[PDB]
Amino acid sequence: DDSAQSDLKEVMVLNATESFVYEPKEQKKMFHATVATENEVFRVKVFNIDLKEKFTPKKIIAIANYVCRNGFLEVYPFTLVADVNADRNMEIPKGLIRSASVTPKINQLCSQTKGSFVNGVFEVHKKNVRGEFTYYEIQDNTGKMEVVVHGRLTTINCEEGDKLKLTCFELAPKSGNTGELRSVIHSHIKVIKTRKNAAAS
Amino acid sequence: SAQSDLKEVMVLNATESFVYEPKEQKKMFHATVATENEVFRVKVFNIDLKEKFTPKKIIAIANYVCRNGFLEVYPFTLVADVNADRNMEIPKGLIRSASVTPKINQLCSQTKGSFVNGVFEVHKKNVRGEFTYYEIQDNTGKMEVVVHGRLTTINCEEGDKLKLTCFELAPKSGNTGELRSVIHSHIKVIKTRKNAAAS
Amino acid sequence: SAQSDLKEVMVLNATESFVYEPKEQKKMFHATVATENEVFRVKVFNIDLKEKFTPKKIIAIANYVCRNGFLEVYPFTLVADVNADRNMEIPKGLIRSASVTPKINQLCSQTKGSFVNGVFEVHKKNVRGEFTYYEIQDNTGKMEVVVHGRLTTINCEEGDKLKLTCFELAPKSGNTGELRSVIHSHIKVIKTRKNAAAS
Amino acid sequence: SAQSDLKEVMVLNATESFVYEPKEQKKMFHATVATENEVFRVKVFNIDLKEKFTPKKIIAIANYVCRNGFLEVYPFTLVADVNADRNMEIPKGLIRSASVTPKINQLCSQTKGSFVNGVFEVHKKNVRGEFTYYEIQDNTGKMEVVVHGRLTTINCEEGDKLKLTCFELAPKSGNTGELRSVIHSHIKVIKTRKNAAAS
DNA sequence: GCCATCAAAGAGAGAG
DNA sequence: TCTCTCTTTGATGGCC
Numbered sequence: 001d002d003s004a005q006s007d008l009k010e011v012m013v014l015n016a017t018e019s020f021v022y023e024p025k026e027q028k029k030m031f032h033a034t035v036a037t038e039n040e041v042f043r044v045k046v047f048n049i050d051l052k053e054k055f056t057p058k059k060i061i062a063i064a065n066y067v068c069r070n071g072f073l074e075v076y077p078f079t080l081v082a083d084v085n086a087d088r089n090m091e092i093p094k095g096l097i098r099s100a101s102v103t104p105k106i107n108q109l110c111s112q113t114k115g116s117f118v119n120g121v122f123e124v125h126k127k128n129v130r131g132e133f134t135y136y137e138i139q140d141n142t143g144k145m146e147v148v149v150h151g152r153l154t155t156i157n158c159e160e161g162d163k164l165k166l167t168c169f170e171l172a173p174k175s176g177n178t179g180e181l182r183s184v185i186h187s188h189i190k191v192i193k194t195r196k197n198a199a200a201s
Numbered sequence: 202s203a204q205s206d207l208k209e210v211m212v213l214n215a216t217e218s219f220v221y222e223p224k225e226q227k228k229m230f231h232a233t234v235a236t237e238n239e240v241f242r243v244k245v246f247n248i249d250l251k252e253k254f255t256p257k258k259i260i261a262i263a264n265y266v267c268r269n270g271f272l273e274v275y276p277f278t279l280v281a282d283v284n285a286d287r288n289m290e291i292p293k294g295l296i297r298s299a300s301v302t303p304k305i306n307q308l309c310s311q312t313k314g315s316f317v318n319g320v321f322e323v324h325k326k327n328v329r330g331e332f333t334y335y336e337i338q339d340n341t342g343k344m345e346v347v348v349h350g351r352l353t354t355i356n357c358e359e360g361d362k363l364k365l366t367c368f369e370l371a372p373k374s375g376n377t378g379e380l381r382s383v384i385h386s387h388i389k390v391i392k393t394r395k396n397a398a399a400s
Numbered sequence: 401s402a403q404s405d406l407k408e409v410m411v412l413n414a415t416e417s418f419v420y421e422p423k424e425q426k427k428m429f430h431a432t433v434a435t436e437n438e439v440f441r442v443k444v445f446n447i448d449l450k451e452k453f454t455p456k457k458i459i460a461i462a463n464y465v466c467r468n469g470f471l472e473v474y475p476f477t478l479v480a481d482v483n484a485d486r487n488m489e490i491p492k493g494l495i496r497s498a499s500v501t502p503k504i505n506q507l508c509s510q511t512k513g514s515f516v517n518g519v520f521e522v523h524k525k526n527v528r529g530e531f532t533y534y535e536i537q538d539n540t541g542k543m544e545v546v547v548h549g550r551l552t553t554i555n556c557e558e559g560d561k562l563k564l565t566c567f568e569l570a571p572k573s574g575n576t577g578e579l580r581s582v583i584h585s586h587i588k589v590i591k592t593r594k595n596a597a598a599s
Numbered sequence: 600s601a602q603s604d605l606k607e608v609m610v611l612n613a614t615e616s617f618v619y620e621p622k623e624q625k626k627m628f629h630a631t632v633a634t635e636n637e638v639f640r641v642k643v644f645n646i647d648l649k650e651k652f653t654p655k656k657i658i659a660i661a662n663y664v665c666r667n668g669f670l671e672v673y674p675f676t677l678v679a680d681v682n683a684d685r686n687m688e689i690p691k692g693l694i695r696s697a698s699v700t701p702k703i704n705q706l707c708s709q710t711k712g713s714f715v716n717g718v719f720e721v722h723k724k725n726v727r728g729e730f731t732y733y734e735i736q737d738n739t740g741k742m743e744v745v746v747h748g749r750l751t752t753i754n755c756e757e758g759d760k761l762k763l764t765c766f767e768l769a770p771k772s773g774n775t776g777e778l779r780s781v782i783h784s785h786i787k788v789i790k791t792r793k794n795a796a797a798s
Numbered sequence: 799g800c801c802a803t804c805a806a807a808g809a810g811a812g813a814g
Numbered sequence: 815t816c817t818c819t820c821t822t823t824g825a826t827g828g829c830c
Contacts, residue, residue, distance in 0.1 A: 098805080101819095105803090113688070121820095142803095195811090214599030217591060219555050226527060256598050297800075297830070328425055354553040356418050389597070397416040398429075398588065400455045400808070496816080499808095519809095593821095695803075698827075738825095 004068030010084060011035035011042065012060045012092055014100060017167060019049045022186055024152050031055070032167050032188055034100050034119075035063075038090050041100040043119070043168070045069075045186055048077040060084045070117060072168075107142040109171055110178040116171050118181065121192070122147070127160045136164060147181045149189075158191045165190035203267035209283055210234035210241065210262060211291060213299070215254040216366065221385055223351055230254070231366050231387055233299060234262070235291050240299035242318070244367070244385055245274040259283040269316060271367075306342035309378040314371055317380060320364045320391070321346075323357060335363065347381040348388075357390040364389035402466035408482055409433040409440065410490060411457045412498060415565060415586055417447040422550055429453070430565050430586055432498055432517075433461075433471075434490050439498040441515070443566075443584060444473040458482035469515055470566070505540035507569055508576035516567050516579060519590075520545070522560050527552075534562060547581040556589040563588035601665030607681060608632035608639070609657045609689060611697070614764065614785055616646040621749060628652070629764045629785055631697060632660070632670075633689050638697040640716070640765070642783060643672040657681035667714055669765070704739030707776045712769055715778055718762045718789070719744075721755060733761060746780040753786055760789040 016033040033044040033055045046055065054061050062082045067074035075081065103120030125144055126137035134154050136147040147164065149156075158164060166181075167188040174180045213233040220228050232243040232254045243265075245254065253260055263279035265272045274280060302319035324343070325336030333353045335346035346363065348355075357363060365380070366387035372378040382388075414431035431442040431453050442461075444453065452459055462478035464471045473479065501518040520536035532552045534545040545562065547554075556562060565586035567579040613630035630641040630652050643652065651658055659679055664671035672678065700717035719735035726732075731751045733744045744766065746753075755761060763778065764785040770776040 095805090215597065217555070217595060217597045218557070223553070252594065254598075294830085300800075302799095351553060354422070354550050356416070358417075392416070395450060395454070398414060400413040493815085500815095691803080695827075699804095700826095 001068055001070060006068055008062065008064035009037055010090065011037050011063060012090065013055045013057050014097065015057060016055045017188055019052060020188060030186060036092050036096060036100065038092055041096050043072050044075060045072050046075045048075060048079065051075065051081050054081045060088065060090060105142045106138065106140045106145045110143065110145055112171060112179055113173060115173060118169050118171055119167050122164045122166060124158055124160055124162050124164060127158065138164065145178060149183045151183055153183045153187060153189055156189060156191055159197055161194060162197060163192040165192060205267060207261060207263040208236055209259060209287065210236050211259045211289065212254045212256050213296065214256055215251065216387055218248040218251055219387060229385065237289065237291060240295055241272050242270065243272050243274060247274060247276040247278065250274060250280050253280050259287055259289065304341040305339050305344050308370060309342065309344045309376050311370055311372045311378055314369065317368050317370045318366050320362055323359060323361050323363055326359060345379040347379055349382055352382050352386065352388060355388060355390060358396060360393040361396055362391040364391055404466055406460055406462035407435055408458065408460045408486065409435055410488060411453055411455045411459065412495065413455055414453045417450060418586065420584055428584065434495060436488055436490050439494060440471050441469060442471045442473055446473065446475045449473065449479055452479050452481065458486050458488060503540040504536060504538045504543050508541060508543055510569060510577055511571050513571060514569050516569055517565050520562050522556060522558055522562060525556065525558050536562065543576055543578065545579045549581065551581050551585060551587060554587060554589055557595060559592055559595065561590035563590060603665055605659060605661035606634060607657065607659050607685065608634050609687060610652050610654050611694065612654055613652045616649055617785060619783055627783065633694060635687055635689060638693060639670050640668055641670045641672060645672065645674040648672065648678055651678050657685050657687065702739035703737050703742050706768060707740060707742045707774050709768060709770050709776060712767060715766050715768050716764050718760055720760045721757055724755065724757055735761060742777060744778040748780060750780050750784055750786055753788060755788045756794055758791045759794060762787040762789060
C-alpha cells in the first residue's frame with residue numbers, strides 16, 4: 001500500500017487458482033495468481049474473472065492500472081492486462097520461482113511478531129469444528145500451530161490427516177510466541193485428500 | 202536395581218520394525234525416549250506400538266520390563282498418549298550424550314561387559330563360514346565387530362559405516378575386546394560416496 | 401546368436417554392488433544402458449567399474465558376454481570413457497519406456513518366459529520355510545512373487561514396495577504368471593514412512 | 600543508485616584489516632552488515648573502526664558512499680553505537696543467502712560483470728610471471744581466477760579452498776568468464792587435510 | 799563432530 | 815502417455 005510504485009510491470013504468470021466466490025452474498029468472484037518480474041515476485045488478486053486465460057502460467061503479460069493493497073497487486077475490470085511480444089524472452093531466476101512456491105515453516109510463523117499474509121501447504125493434525133469457526137491444527141517437523149476457518153470456508157471437506165493448500169491467510173500476533181492464522185475475505189483453500197479418504201473409481 | 206514406575210517420556214527416535222528372530226518370525230523395534238533427568242533405550246516387542254513411538258510424541262509407559270539396562274515393552278505393557286498440557290522441556294546436553302558414539306580405545310579397554318550402540322568406520326572386513334568380521338577404527342585405535350546369524354547377509358563394505366544397535370561388548374584379555382551381534386542386535390548401514398544405486 | 405560388436409552407450413541407472421553369491425562372496429551390480437536406438441540390460445561383474453557406470457556417462461563397452469537378454473560385463477571386458485565428441489541424444493520415449501513397470505494383468509497373460517525390472521506393492525506376504533511369497537497388486541490385477549535364498553532375509557512387510565531386478569516370469573497354468581527370484585535377482589524394498597525408522 | 604541515508608544495521612562478519620595498496624600502505628577491512636530487510640557489502644577505510652565492527656553488534660551508519668554494490672566507509676563517515684533500545688530481528692533466510700557461495704554454472708555464463716564473494720576449492724594452479732591463475736570447481740562446473748599483485752604471494756596449493764571477497768567477474772565471449780583480482784580483493788585460504796602445519 | 803536449515807532429483811498423481 | 819508437483823535425497827552452515 002504505502003509508497004506503492006504502482007508503475008507498469010512486465011511479469012510472467014507462475015501459478016493460479018480457479019475462479020471462485022469469496023463473497024457469497026453478492027456472488028463476488030475472484031482468483032489468485034502469483035507473478036514475477038525478472039527482479040521480484042508478486043501475489044495477485046484478480047477481481048475481473050475474465051482474465052484467467054491471460055493468466056495461464058508460462059505466459060508473459062503486461063500489467064498496469066492495478067491497485068496496491070496489503071502487499072498485493074489488485075486487478076480490476078479497469079486494470080490493463082495484455083500480451084507481451086516474443087521479443088523479450090525474459091529469463092526469471094530459479095531461486096525466486098522456488099521461494100514464491102515455498103511453504104513457511106510453522107515455528108517461524110509462531111515466532112513471528114509481525115502480521116502478514118501466507119500461502120503454503122499444511123498438514124492437518126487436529127480438526128475441531130465449533131459453530132461457525134472451525135480450527136485446524138497443522139503440523140510439521142519443526143512444530144505445530146492453529147488455523148481458524150470462518151465464513152464460506154467452513155463448508156469444505158478436510159479431515160484430520162488431510163492437507164490444506166493455503167492461499168492468502170492472515171497471520172496475527174498472538175501471545176505465547178505462537179501465532180494464529182485467520183480466514184479472511186480473499187482467503188482460498190485447496191484441500192489435498194490422501195488416497196484413502198478420496199472417492200474411488 | 203531398576204525403577205519400573207510409570208514414566209512420561211518423549212520418543213526421540215525409533216528404528217523400523219524388523220525380524221530379530223527368523224525361526225518363529227518374532228519381530229521388534231528399538232527406541233529411545235527421555236524424561237527430564239535421563240535417556241532410556243527401549244526394546245519394544247509389540248510392534249503395533251510403532252505409531253506411538255513416533256518421535257516428538259509424549260507417551261506414558263507402564264508395566265514394562267527393565268532388562269540389561271533396557272526397558273522392554275511387551276503387549277501387556279501400557280503405552281498411551283499423554284495429557285496435551287505437558288510441554289516438558291528436555292535438556293539438550295543429555296540428548297547428545299545419549300546420541301554420542303563411544304571411542305574405540307575406550308571400549309576395547311572395558312572392564313565390565315556392556316551393550317553398546319554407536320556408529321563406526323569399517324576398514325577391513327573378513328568372511329569366514331557363518332561369521333563375518335568387521336575391522337573398525339577411529340582416531341583412538343581399532344577393534345572388531347563380530348556378526349553372526351541374520352545379519353551376516355547384510356551388505357556393508359570397506360569405507361561403509363555401521364550404525365549399530367544393542368551389540369554386546371565382550372571384553373577380552375589384553376585389550377582385545379570386541380563387539381558381537383546379539384539376539385536383539387540391529388544395524389543400519391550408511392554407505393560412502395557411491396556405494397549404492399543411482400537414479 | 402548375439403552380435404557382441406562394440407556399443408557406445410549412455411548410463412541410465414545402476415544398482416549398488418552386492419554379494420549375489422554368499423559362498424564365494426561373489427559380487428555384481430546391474431545397470432541399464434542405452435544407445436540412441438535401443439535399451440540394454442547390463443550385468444557388471446567387475447565392481448571397480450562402478451565409477452565408469454555413473455549415470456549420464458557415455459561409455460564404450462566391448463567384448464562382453466550376451467546371455468539371457470543381458471550384457472554381462474567381466475574383468476576382461478572393454479569399458480572406457482566417451483569424450484565430448486559423441487554428444488549423443490537419446491529419445492525420451494525410449495528412455496522412459498525402459499523405466500516403466502509392466503502392469504500386473506500383462507505379466508500374467510504373458511505366456512512366455514522373460515526377465516523383469518519392476519516396482520510393486522506387497523499385498524500378502526506369507527513366509528513359508530526358506531521361501532517367501534509376496535502377492536503384488538496394481539490397478540490391473542494381482543499376482544505372486546517367489547523368493548528364496550539370501551533374498552528371504554529381507555525385511556519387507558505387507559504395505560511396502562518391491563524394487564526388483566532380473567526376476568524370471570514363467571509360464572504357469574491359469575493365465576497368471578509368477579516371478580521367481582533368480583541368482584542375479586536384486587531387490588530394493590521401499591518402506592512407507594510410518595513403518596520406516598525415525599528420529 | 601543506492602540509499603545513502605542513515606542505516607541502522609547489525610554487524611554479521613568482517614575481515615582483519617589488511618594493506619590493499621602497499622605503495623602508500625593503504626589499509627582497509629571488509630564487513631557484512633544487515634538490517635531487518637536486507638544485507639550490504641561494506642568497505643571500511645578507517646581501520647580504527649574495527650572495534651565498532653564486532654559481529655552481533657548494532658551500529659548506525661550515514662554519510663557513506665555507495666559504489667559497486669558496496670557501502671564505502673571513510674574517516675569522515677559516521678559510525679556510532681546503537682541505542683540499547685533497538686532490539687532488531689533479522690531473518691535467517693536473508694543472512695544465509697548472503698553467505699551462500701555461487702555455483703560455477705551460474706558465474707561463467709553471465710554477460711555482465713559484478714563483484715563476487717565465495718568459497719571455492721582449487722583444482723589446478725599454474726604460475727606465469729607477475730600473474731597467477733587458479734582453476735576452481737564445484738558440482739556445477741569449473742573455471743579460472745586470475746590474481747596479479749599482492750595476492751600472488753599467498754600460500755595456496757591444489758586441493759585447498761579459496762575464500763574470496765570482492766573479486767571481479769569479467770564475462771568473456773562464449774562462457775569464458777572469470778574472476779579477476781582487483782585493488783580491494785581479499786583472500787583467506789582454508790587449507791585441507793595433509794597440506795597445513797602440524798603441532 | 800552432530801543437527802539445524804536448505805537446494806536438486808526420482809517418482810508419484812493429474813490431465814489431455 | 816507425457817507434464818507438474820511433489821515427497822524424497824544429498825549439502826552446507828552453526829553449536830558443543
